[PDB]
Request: fold
Amino acid sequence: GKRQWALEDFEIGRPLGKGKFGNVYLAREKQSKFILALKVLFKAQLEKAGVEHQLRREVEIQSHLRHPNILRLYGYFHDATRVYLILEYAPLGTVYRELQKLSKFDEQRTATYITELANALSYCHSKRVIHRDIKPENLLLGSAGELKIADFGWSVHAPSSRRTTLCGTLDYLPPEMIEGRMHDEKVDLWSLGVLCYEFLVGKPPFEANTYQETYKRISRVEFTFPDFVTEGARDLISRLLKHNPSQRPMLREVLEHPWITANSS
Amino acid sequence: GKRQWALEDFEIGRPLGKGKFGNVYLAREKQSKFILALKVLFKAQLEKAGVEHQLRREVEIQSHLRHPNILRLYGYFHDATRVYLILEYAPLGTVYRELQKLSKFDEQRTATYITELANALSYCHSKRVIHRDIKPENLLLGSAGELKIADFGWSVHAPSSRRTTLCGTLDYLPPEMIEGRMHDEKVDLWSLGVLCYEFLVGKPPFEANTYQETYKRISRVEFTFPDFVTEGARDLISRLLKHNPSQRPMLREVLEHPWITANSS
Amino acid sequence: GMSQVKSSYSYDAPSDFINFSSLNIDSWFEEKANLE
Amino acid sequence: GMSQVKSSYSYDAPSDFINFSSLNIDSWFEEKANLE
Ligand SMILES: COc1ccc(Nc2nc(NCCc3ccccc3F)nc(Nc3ccc4ncccc4c3)n2)cc1OC
Ligand SMILES: COc1ccc(Nc2nc(NCCc3ccccc3F)nc(Nc3ccc4ncccc4c3)n2)cc1OC
Reply:
């Protein structure tokens, strides 16, 4: 075949982020002087945690996606002990960090993110891919402050049948997963509303002291709005946060939502 | 609902077998004085290894299977720290242990096992279930020395589409898994031939010093027969050990195989 | 990043006490498949 | 019993060096689905 990636192809700098199986480092490719993020995963730890299968889905899916709102995976390589992922650089860090600095986002910032993400998701869902792990942590920011979804380890190409894997993150889990039912692409829409809530409010709607309580709340769609959340915002979240997945709107309905169009830029 | 299982329902004795996440114990249910195997799995260790999903597939599948050659899962229960599986007792231990005592099996013993297992598999495959982990270790023995497959943690209900999970055990892995291709029910037939070989020979056909070498051998269907292996036996193994899954025989062809009918009892 | 969600260990599987001495349900697979 | 098989980490994914300055393949999903 052709020339293959080598660790010796990259000049490494500051660690951008720490993770359980290794870090992401600010990286430069020598020949071009091009800025990347090199994610370094240890095989021993991936196998110990039994997540290489999830690592394969990430690499195999993300790398075949092209969208200005989905963080690129240019390619991958490995040695004896580690797996390397060559990811697009996102200069403005995570959305999670932005949220932590501002406590909560205004309507304009939220609706814009929720557009950019709804576009990225619309593209995924067109390729029959479900992300399954939408959350502030998995959302990054580009040069012009554009939203980029990443962290595709729980994602899945589901072209025909529904899926059964209980996966995602505590506050963002859809009820059909909690109740042990098969799931479809409509899980991304649920977590999209939990995102929209947390964006506007500063905390997620079913947050509790125990995972047990949260699970009950999500199951029951048990949540209220603070007084500042506008009718428009209230409408959209309520629509996305339906217990019955088929009662959640299509992403096209989210993109054309009066509150989205009236605040998105 | 109705009365549910409790740890206080069982008198415990000798440990039948040790495993990574806990042991199987000889167990008696108090009210009936009925002999069981109680398998005890620790949640902390299942979650650490990221295998609860595999544990759910085992419980949900095995418990809905009924065959005299498939070890029963009468039911399950759990407390704060552990999961308990209430399994049928197999008085004559594992087939693996029998093989270790005898070094190798004669043709009569082999063909009989391979019938009993082919029947169990035939039933699974009729319910659209693939076991995916056939090996001497996962095979137990009943009162009259009947074969019982168990260990359904890698199993899967695959009613429509092929599967992608790399799983099983080193020497028994089908080549389509090694080459990273989707797989179907025909993986049970491959491992059925690797079983049949190991039964007759005492070691499996692609055995090597490294997993890397084994992988090459399986990929290449690289194996030879010792001089004592009869033409009949040679034919069946060669048929089951086809690189192309669709060239492997149906189980019905295995059950009616001249060497199987001429040696099975 | 990636994380593993805690399961509630509530399986579509028998938890009912059974009276052992003494005493149709494999259609579960056909029914679970026939879900639209 | 149950065990985890070692993977060979050979993925249907780009390992080819790329010349960054400077320079259709999302059909991969439709093609992988269209396998009989
Ligand atoms: C893609 O894989 C990962 C993605 C992000 C992170 N975590 C991270 N954490 C922080 N602060 C730490 C706060 C914090 C602390 C505890 C938990 C969450 C949390 F967010 N900053 C950043 N910045 C950036 C900036 C540009 C990037 N471009 C490309 C790729 C990554 C980039 C990460 N990333 C880690 C990952 O793998 C391990
Ligand atoms: C179903 O889950 C398990 C099944 C079998 C075992 N392992 C086991 N190992 C031994 N000797 C140990 C040799 C040995 C050593 C190292 C590796 C493999 C190996 F085989 N004897 C037995 N005997 C029996 C007898 C009747 C049974 N009836 C019902 C259920 C189990 C039964 C097990 N089992 C463990 C399991 O879970 C942890």
In short: The longest helix of chain B spans residues 107-126. The first strand of chain B starts at residue 10 and ends at 17. DSSP finds ten helices and nine strands in chain B.
